[PDB]
Design a binder for this molecule. Structure first.
Ligand SMILES: [Ca+2]
Ligand SMILES: [Ca+2]
Lengths: 7, 279
């Protein structure tokens, strides 16, 4: 799930 | 138009060559287009957005970007200093929480939301969606991305940051969208960038300066940073009338800088997003 880094 | 001392990635998008620092672009700048940033939100009050950003949907207690990631991505699409398409309209859809995470069910709902919501917005030059997110392969997530694209939105998605084949990640692996890998300022494939047959294009993704929450800025890295370069480029090209939402990914690949990148594995495109702007 989710994205690539609350970056 | 020329923006001196631009972030390297903006300069790269308007150059045949690495190593320059001015971004050149047609002054139309994506005016009349719209880009949805489906992410942790957008700090619309940031001076860099000049009132051109707004939140339109959240699935959480607040529409505020409490993370920064979505604000950074939005800045690369469309901020005055850090953006590719400096006059586009930005719409935030908060599918990711402030830890940068979201359930696939929420992410799917957000994509279907954009497919409908564009009919509530004024985007005479067309509509783009930027998805700097993903997880493991999901046919349902891919199908949502496919619907969004089919509905008349140029969908750009991150390839992922696994240094692996993007076939195993979603929405990266959906063939019909524009799957974006990352490069660095020396035209290397970014160390973390996914690759594979499903990639359509690369954009700048290592050490990308953009907006952050609290009215700030910072440099971060990821295929999340490459994706909004491509989304903004699409909006810009659509405003110019050079392409359409259905055809923009192909057009960007057609007109890309070819063969410039290093460490591209055989079977992955060696194509770097390029605006082909000639003053
Ligand atoms: Ca050169
Ligand atoms: Ca594709």
């Amino acid at each position: 799930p989710a994205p690539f880094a609350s970056a | 138009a020329a923006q001196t001392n631009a972030p390297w990635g903006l300069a790269r998008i308007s150059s045949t060559s690495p190593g320059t620092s001015t971004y050149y672009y047609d002054e139309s700048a994506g005016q009349g287009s719209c880009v949805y940033v489906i992410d942790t939100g957008i700090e619309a009050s940031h001076p860099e957005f000049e009132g051109r950003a707004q939140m339109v949907k959240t699935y959480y207690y607040s529409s505020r970007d409490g993370n920064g990631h979505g604000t950074h991505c939005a800045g690369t699409v469309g901020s005055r200093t850090y953006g590719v398409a400096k006059k586009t309209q930005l719409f935030g859809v908060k599918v990711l929480d402030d830890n940068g995470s979201g359930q696939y069910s929420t992410i799917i709902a957000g994509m279907d939301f954009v497919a409908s919501d564009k009919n509530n917005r004024n985007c005479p030059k067309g509509v783009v969606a930027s998805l700097s997110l993903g997880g493991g392969y999901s046919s349902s997530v891919n199908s949502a991305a496919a619907r969004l694209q089919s509905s008349g939105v140029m969908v750009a998605v991150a390839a992922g940051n696994n240094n692996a084949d993007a076939r195993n990640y979603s929405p990266a692996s959906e063939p019909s969208v524009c799957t974006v890998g990352a490069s660095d300022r020396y035209d290397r494939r970014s160390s973390f960038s996914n690759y594979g047959s499903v990639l359509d294009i690369f954009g700048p993704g290592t050490d990308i300066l953009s907006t952050w929450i609290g009215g700030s800025t910072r440099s971060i890295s990821g295929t999340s940073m490459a994706t909004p370069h491509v989304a903004g480029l699409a909006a810009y090209l659509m405003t110019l009338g050079k392409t359409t939402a259905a055809s923009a990914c192909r057009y960007i690949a057609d007109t890309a800088n070819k063969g410039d990148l290093s460490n591209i594995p055989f079977g992955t495109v060696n194509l770097l997003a390029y605006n082909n702007y000639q003053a």
